[PDB]
Amino acid sequence: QSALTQPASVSGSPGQSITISCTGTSSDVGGYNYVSWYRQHPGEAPKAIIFDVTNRPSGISNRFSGSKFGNTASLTISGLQAEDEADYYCAAYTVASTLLFGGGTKVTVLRQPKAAPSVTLFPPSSEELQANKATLVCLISDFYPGAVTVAWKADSSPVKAGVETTTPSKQSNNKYAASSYLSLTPEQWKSHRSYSCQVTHEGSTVEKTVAPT
Amino acid sequence: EVQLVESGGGVVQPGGSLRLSCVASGFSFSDFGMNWVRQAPGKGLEWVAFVPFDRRINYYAESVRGRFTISRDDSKNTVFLQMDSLRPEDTAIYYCAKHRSQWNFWPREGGLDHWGQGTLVTVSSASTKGPSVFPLAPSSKSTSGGTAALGCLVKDYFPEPVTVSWNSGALTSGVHTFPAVLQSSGLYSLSSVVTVPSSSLGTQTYICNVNHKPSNTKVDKKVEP
């Protein structure tokens, strides 16, 4: 029941062509030609843009085209225009007679230089520890395009429990901000040597680390 | 044109039940299979359920099977989604969506050609609550280029929003109040930071003024090294 695999972020300058991949398995994308694509603008409902791999509904610009080979379907958007900036989802019929959506891709139409995130990581406060709680605060700002993935480490090992991460929010400078929070018990905090917040943006990771006092 | 109108959304306690409706118009309803697809706040689309043309087998995502039931009333051009044993993770906008191809028994040919605007289902026991505010002290870890970042962590409030000022609004430059995270409990948390000259830390007082109008709670907290 895992989503079909799409890239988090695909971007291009106005006028360029971009392609979004959608990788399933022989149980779905590679099993049938019933692959569809949907465009969703923020605050709005999804709209069908491609169906049965290659077909465009009427009203849909012919700058959009769909294809598929093996377990991967692709949406191509040529002559990128401002209005194309949106989230895009693929979906495929499956061998279980269900319809399964991909994880979605944010398409950015680049209108300023790409900018890696600024990451600031705060340890639990002595006040919070006395309340018998502990929160690590990873603040991520001024990044563009507006998509990041966040991972946390206790010492050198990943931790997934107790993580909550916001979706990126557009700032007044048209870059993006996000936050991630790791909840621990005070004893967890104090036992380990350090914790780390790792933020990946456009394939590159910036890391920050804090330690108990 | 095709119109799909969802209703029935609202706030429900975990373990509770809710029935959604989708009223369709602008096409021959009884000829098409219908779907529910949901979307958690800021997350992706998740297909939920399909009801075929003409009373065959209903199909469901594993995530909801055994708790949700889809059905239709062709005389009323209505699709229903009965939701039982609701969980916080069921919180989402629920969309009604028509299948493109006529008379299909599965959510197969043609994909989902038309969608409603959705109805919000919130599964939560949260109730009005002011935040707990904790300082985020400046230190060497949050200091670069002779500029120190300090902040306030505004935990566990409901509903949105909180506002944060610094020094009663006199400090505005370098202020950043981040968007809130929604916790599994149904409560929110956010942080506000301000960047200041690291040389002023011993001489200047920095206070975050947290205002949570929905609970009528105000907190002023000094933040220092």
Numbering used by the authors:
A (entry chain L): 1 to 9, 11 to 27, 27A, 27B, 27C, 28 to 95, 95A, 96 to 106, ...
B (entry chain H): 1 to 52, 52A, 53 to 82, 82A, 82B, 82C, 83 to 100, 100A, ...
The authors write:
Multiple VHs and VLs were obtained, but only one VH, named 19.3H-HC, neutralized the founder Env when combined with either of two highly related VLs. To interrogate the antigen-binding site characteristics of R880F mAbs that influenced their distinct neutralization profiles, crystal structures of the 19.3H-L1 and 19.3H-L3 Fabs were determined to the resolutions of 1.7 Å and 2.7 Å, respectively. ODA analyses indicated that the antigen-binding sites of 19.3H-L1 and 19.3H-L3 were very flat, forming roughly rectangular shapes approximately 15 Å wide and 30 Å long on top of the six CDR loops.
Five total amino acid differences between the 19.3H-L1 and 19.3H-L3 VLs congregated in and around CDR1: 19.3H-L3 contained two threonines (T) and one phenylalanine (F) in CDR1 that were not present in 19.3H-L1, while arginine (R) and glutamic acid (E) residues arose just downstream of CDR1 in the FWR2 region of 19.3H-L1 that were not present in 19.3H-L3. 19.3H-L1 neutralized 2-B12 more potently than the founder Envs; this was directly attributed to D341N, as this single substitution introduced into Env 0-B24 (0-B24 D341N) increased the founder Env's sensitivity to that of 2-B12. 19.3H-L1 modestly competed with itself but could not effectively compete for binding with 19.3H-L3. Three CDR1 residues that differed between 19.3H-L1 and 19.3H-L3 (Ser/Thr at residue 27, Gly/Thr at residue 29, and Tyr/Phe at residue 32; Kabat numbering scheme) did not create any substantial structural differences between the two antigen-binding sites. These changes did, however, have the potential to influence antigen-antibody interactions. In combination, the structural, neutralization, and ELISA binding data indicate that mAbs 19.3H-L1 and 19.3H-L3 likely recognize overlapping epitopes that are centered on I295 and E338; however, 19.3H-L1 is more dependent on D341N and the N333 glycan motif for neutralization than 19.3H-L3.
